[PDB]
Amino acid sequence: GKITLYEDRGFQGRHYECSSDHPNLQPYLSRCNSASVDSGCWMLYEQPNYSGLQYFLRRGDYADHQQWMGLSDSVRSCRLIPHSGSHRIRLYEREDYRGQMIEFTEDCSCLQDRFRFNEIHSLNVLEGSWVLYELSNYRGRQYLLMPGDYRRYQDWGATNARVGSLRRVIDF
């Protein structure tokens, strides 16, 4: 993968090129207002060392931070999300994989249309990387999910169990 981050809007200002995970952009970039993704799927992070608000970017050009749904121009670390050959996630009504369960292998823009629960209290990412969104149609707070067990919503870094949509991390 390759991403170019720019300090100012419309691909102007001081810039920095990443080919891999960077836990600390602070010495190189004082803010980020535009970005060009040549290749790979990237997660940008408000704070250093992959913490604070998260933003998913794919191949393409972002002329201002609003285009990746950024709330500010703070980008202090970034992750190249590894390629996955296949995608499967189980969502559960309750903590520790109890209650009603639904399994997805494809993107879902409205979770409540398939699974009549506003809150997801645990999930199992069996295959691939996903992005959980707080709201329907891929809006609100974003949480990157990599393969693993998530026995409660804190495990995916959320302050609540609100989930409205989710998407596979895929290029194409």
Author numbering: 1 to 172
What's written in the study?
Human gamma-D crystallin (HGD) is a soluble, monomeric protein expressed in the eye lens during fetal development. The high expression levels contribute to the refractive index within the lens which focuses visible light upon the retina. However, this halts further expression of HGD. This means HGD must remain correctly folded and soluble for the entire human lifespan in order to maintain visual acuity. In order to observe structural changes in HGD, we take advantage of an arginine-to-serine point mutation, R36S, first identified in congenital cataracts (HGDm).
UV-lability of the Cys-DTT disulfide was tested by exposing similarly aged crystals to a UV LED at 285 nm during X-ray data collection. We show that UV exposure is then able to disrupt the disulfide bond, and partially restore the conformation to that of fresh crystallin. No evidence of these modifications was observed in the electron density of the light structure nor was it possible to locate the liberated DTT. The analysis of atomic coordinate-derived conformational space (RoPE, described in Methods Section 4.6), show that while aging of the crystal produces a large shift in the conformational space, this is partially reversed by UV exposure. The corresponding interatomic distance plots also show a reversal of the conformational changes that occurred during aging for each chain. In support of this, we have shown that after UV illumination of aged crystals, HGDm returns at least in part to the original conformational state of fresh protein. Hence, disulfide cleavage likely proceeds in the most part via tryptophan excitation.
